């Protein structure tokens, strides 16, 4: 007739650390740190990402001929860019407020492309068919951006542009344009009439006048001249005007968009797989429920907080000491 | 001939959550989370707030005629802007570094309006009575800002303007000004004889030359032309120089300000009353010493860290078990 | 008390039953269930109280915004240190408490038996008890169930104490 008081022992090898002791073996434990990922990218919130692949965001948004084949989704949860992203701006230049455009486009509730100024009838007084460059040919065709067209003088005459878009849509409109800065004065006169010229773009919100900056520059690609790229948002009902005699690269396409809750841009070479996840990481989708993760902290979505520690595990059982 | 040991109980309904079990009834508890407010704005640091009611920070600081019903104060704890603060800049425009000016104005220990360039003697060669616009009505008539004046040609001639102010005070002076951008060339030629004109403003540290950008713009508030608004601080012992040949809107009043940048900007539609608190929240002032509050993320002063939890009730008594 | 039992099949806390009519390792069902439920609430409080919003981290900055870029890094690094440090201490503190909590319950079970027997059994000191009186399986179940009476076989135990 004997009774003895004790507790369960097991074969478990899970080792848990505590304040007073380290490397304590426990019969049962719960992991708090998630260290796995699917290894493939998936659709965050069930909405497909926009995958640009080789093409940069400037290239796709401007219609870079190399990545003309990219399809347009009506909605995006986030943007995937590869580490070898190239073919962004295809004519040497620099976007101003580039990062602001990239950030605003990271999450869009509705995104549709439309032709803002139809090429056939919008500019009968200018030559729209010679706006090409050798810097970014399509299959050697010596072509140019798909979303913008570059107007040149016709018949050695360049009438002043006085174009506008009323914007009678119910969603914000993203309008992009550029300014060309020829290599020398001879190129300004050969390409455009009126060596002394200005370009003005504005809305009720935005009003800015530009002037060509003509100088010989270091060669990038095979040309010295540069282009600056600008973008604005046009509020619903807010008329946008383009008044110009100078080196204005007029838009052809513009985007109607309504922005979703802010998201981010992920740079990763991980292939895209069709599945759904709670959270996206650059190494693959994570759909865990644990409070912490140790996957690279550039996550997009609601996610576990990133920690550096190798392991976080809570004890639930008793110390495993067979006897 | 017996004794019993036990703990006290009462008719308490305070519910306390613990790590192991929830909804524990205790005989005493302390609520560490403030969820009440008085519904009203009040004094912070014992100095009355500046309440704009219907005016925008831009409207008040430029002297918008609709804002004349508001009197200034020698000191501010914070600035209160309402959801109906539509009466801001009258003339269509874009106020440069507006947010930075709002931060500089968040609180001032000594603020006085000084007449920097008296109308009677400061512009003997220019007409200081014209410059009223339909975009800034007052009493049904065209008017203009009270702190700034818009100079026009006096006698079919616009002599070059060269004015300066020497800061003979012991405090920094906030000087506001602006530049007019006429809609078309004909409007500038009628308004200013020079047509080709520049505006230069500078201090010891600040030096900037501006030029009018003449272009046809979308019509805003019945006008096509735009105004740009600028501001600068003049340190004691320094001077401000205004040199211009046209298109300059020059100040009449400027402010002497001993800045206290600790405070912020509060958005609230509730009235200001008389009391003394340490932190002001948009829903209302609070009066507490507790570590946490769940009223609003945006507060000004020494208050508890905003927490999203419903309750942080800390037990002080023992478990209540009727028996 | 002094070590665990590999002979238990289902349960965390329990008793060793050695009797002339049989032997086995019968778990303490009520205490194990109360402790497990409390540990479950402990873990669920640690996991579910983390407030997660739909957010995005990581920002692209221009060459001329390096001062801001490092601030973003500073913010991320500061949050990293906080999240690492508190998480490590939280885990370590919870583990310490969990182990002490479990040890308390087993000691409580020992006391549960001790106060119930009221000097009707010999305390060994190694976490075990040796009964002085003859205890059948029904008696054993009465002890396991927490409804055992020292009077029921009190005189016999006294006689067995005299036999010492």
């Amino acid at each position, epitope marked *: 007739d004997t009774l003895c008081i004790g507790y369960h022992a097991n074969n478990s090898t899970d080792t848990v650390d505590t304040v007073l002791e380290k490397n304590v073996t426990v019969t049962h434990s719960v992991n708090l740190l998630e260290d796995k990922h699917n290894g493939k990218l998936c659709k965050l919130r069930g909405v497909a990402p926009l995958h640009l692949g080789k093409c940069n965001i400037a290239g796709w948004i401007l219609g870079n001929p190399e990545c003309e084949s990219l399809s347009t989704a009506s909605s995006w949860s986030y943007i995937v860019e590869t580490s070898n992203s190239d073919n962004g701006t295809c004519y040497p230049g620099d976007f101003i407020n580039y990062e602001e455009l990239r950030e605003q486009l990271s999450s869009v509730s509705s995104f549709e492309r439309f032709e803002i100024f139809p090429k056939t009838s919008s500019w009968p007084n200018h030559d729209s068919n010679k706006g090409v460059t050798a810097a970014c040919p399509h299959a050697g065709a010596k072509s140019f951006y798909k979303n913008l067209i570059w107007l040149v003088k016709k018949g050695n005459s360049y009438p002043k542009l006085n174009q506008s878009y009323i914007n009678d849509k119910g969603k914000e409109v993203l309008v992009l344009w550029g300014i060309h800065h020829p290599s020398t004065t001879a190129d300004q006169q050969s390409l455009y009439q009126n060596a002394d010229a200005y370009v003005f773009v504005g809305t009720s919100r935005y009003s800015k006048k530009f002037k060509p900056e003509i100088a010989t520059r270091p060669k990038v690609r095979d040309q010295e001249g540069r282009m600056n790229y600008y973008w604005t948002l046009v509020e619903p009902g807010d008329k946008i005007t383009f008044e110009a005699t100078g080196n204005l690269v007029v838009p052809r396409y513009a985007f109607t968009m309504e922005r979703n809750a802010g998201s981010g841009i992920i740079i990763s070479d991980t292939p895209v797989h069709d599945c759904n996840t709670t959270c996206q990481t650059p190494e693959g989708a994570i759909n865990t429920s644990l409070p912490f993760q140790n996957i690279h902290p550039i996550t997009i979505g609601k996610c576990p907080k990133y920690v550096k520690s190798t392991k976080l595990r809570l004890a639930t059982g008793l110390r495993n000491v067979p006897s | 001939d017996t004794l019993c040991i036990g703990y006290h109980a009462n008719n308490s309904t305070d519910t306390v959550d613990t790590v192991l079990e929830k909804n524990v009834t205790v005989t005493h508890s302390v609520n560490l989370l403030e969820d009440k407010h008085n519904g009203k704005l009040c004094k912070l640091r014992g100095v009355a707030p500046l309440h704009l009611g219907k005016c925008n920070i831009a409207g008040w600081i430029l002297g918008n005629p609709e804002c004349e019903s508001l009197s200034t104060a020698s000191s501010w704890s914070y600035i209160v802007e309402t959801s109906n603060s539509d009466n801001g800049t009258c003339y269509p425009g874009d106020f440069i570094n507006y947010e930075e000016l709002r931060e500089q104005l968040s609180s001032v220990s000594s603020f006085e309006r000084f007449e920097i360039f008296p109308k009677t003697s400061s512009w003997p060669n220019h007409d200081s009575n014209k410059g009223v616009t339909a975009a800034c009505p007052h009493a049904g008539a065209k008017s203009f800002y009270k702190n700034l004046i818009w100079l026009v040609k006096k006698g079919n001639s616009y002599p070059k303007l060269n004015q300066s102010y020497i800061n003979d005070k012991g405090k920094e002076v906030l000087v506001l000004w602006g530049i007019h951008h006429p809609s078309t060339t004909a409007d500038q030629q009628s308004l200013y004889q020079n047509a080709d004109a520049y505006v230069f403003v500078g201090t010891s540290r600040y030096s900037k030359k501006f030029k009018p950008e003449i272009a046809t713009r979308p019509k805003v508030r019945d006008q096509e032309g735009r105004m740009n608004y600028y501001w600068t601080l003049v340190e004691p012992g320094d001077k401000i120089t205004f040199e211009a040949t046209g298109n300059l809107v020059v100040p009449r009043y400027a402010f002497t300000m001993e800045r206290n940048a600790g405070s912020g900007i509060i958005i609230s539609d509730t009235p200001v009353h008389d009391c003394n608190t340490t932190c002001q929240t948009p829903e209302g002032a609070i009066n507490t010493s507790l570590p946490f509050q769940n009223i609003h993320p945006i507060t000004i002063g020494k208050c508890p860290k905003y927490v999203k939890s419903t309750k942080l009730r800390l037990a002080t008594g023992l478990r209540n078990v009727p028996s | 008390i002094e070590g665990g039992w590999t002979g238990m099949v289902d349960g965390w806390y329990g008793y060793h039953h050695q009797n002339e009519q049989g032997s086995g390792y019968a778990a303490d*069902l009520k205490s194990t269930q109360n402790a497990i439920d409390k540990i479950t609430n402990k*873990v669920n409080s640690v996991i579910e109280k983390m407030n997660t919003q739909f957010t995005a981290v990581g920002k692209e900055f221009n060459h001329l915004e390096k001062r801001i870029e490092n601030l973003n890094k500073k913010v991320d690094d500061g949050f990293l240190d906080i999240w690492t440090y508190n998480a490590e201490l939280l885990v370590l503190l919870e583990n310490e408490r969990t182990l002490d909590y479990h040890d308390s319950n087993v000691k409580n079970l020992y006391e549960k038996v001790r106060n119930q027997l009221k000097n009707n059994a010999k305390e060994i000191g190694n976490g075990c008890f040796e009964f002085y009186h003859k205890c059948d399986n029904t008696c054993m179940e009465s002890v396991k169930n927490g409804t055992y009476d020292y009077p029921k076989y009190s005189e016999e135990a006294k006689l067995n104490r005299e036999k010492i």
Partner: antibody
Amino acid sequence: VQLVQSGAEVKKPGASVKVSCKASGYTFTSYGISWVRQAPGQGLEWMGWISAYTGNTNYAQKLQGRVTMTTDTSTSTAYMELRSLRSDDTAVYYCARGLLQGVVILDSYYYTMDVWGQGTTVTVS
Amino acid sequence: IVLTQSPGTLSLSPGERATLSCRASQSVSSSYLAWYQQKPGQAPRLLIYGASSRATGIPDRFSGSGSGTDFTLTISRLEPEDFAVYYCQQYGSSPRWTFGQGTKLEI
């Protein structure tokens, strides 16, 4: 895997009724067993829960004192005693697998009723 | 604790969204809510285990969501089997469950 309810019967007011639920296809003592009442129309209102592993029970506060449950783990059948039946209590009762016992519950699955029985369709008149 | 079904899907056609939602009287953890389907004449079955996820032998058309006090079922495409009464199951702090009123979809 399955839960099998006993046959239906018709009782008169004031009697007590014994309702049996046989479970199979899974370890009986890992999961609790709950009862849910469904009157004609209206909807489901919870009747009670019994822990098959520990014997712990929990009953609706407004029904306390008339509903008692036991579990026979050697036969793997749960029993419900319903005292003082009234005519408004005619309903189909369902047996369901509830919160599991003996391990830490991290998943949300086990806080739900996954397998349900056919229904005993007890009529009171 | 109680829930209000406030059904908005009393009468609708197959092929369109059934925007049914449930409101809890108090904020609850998402891990304690579940949605059940019962076809008249058959025993009930489980549809969703928690507001955030589905892990059973059911067509992918059933996908819920929700947080705090406001939870939804939002079944993406209807079918003949689909029209059946829906229930909200809420687990409390004690081992007790409570149900909402539910609603029937008229074909």
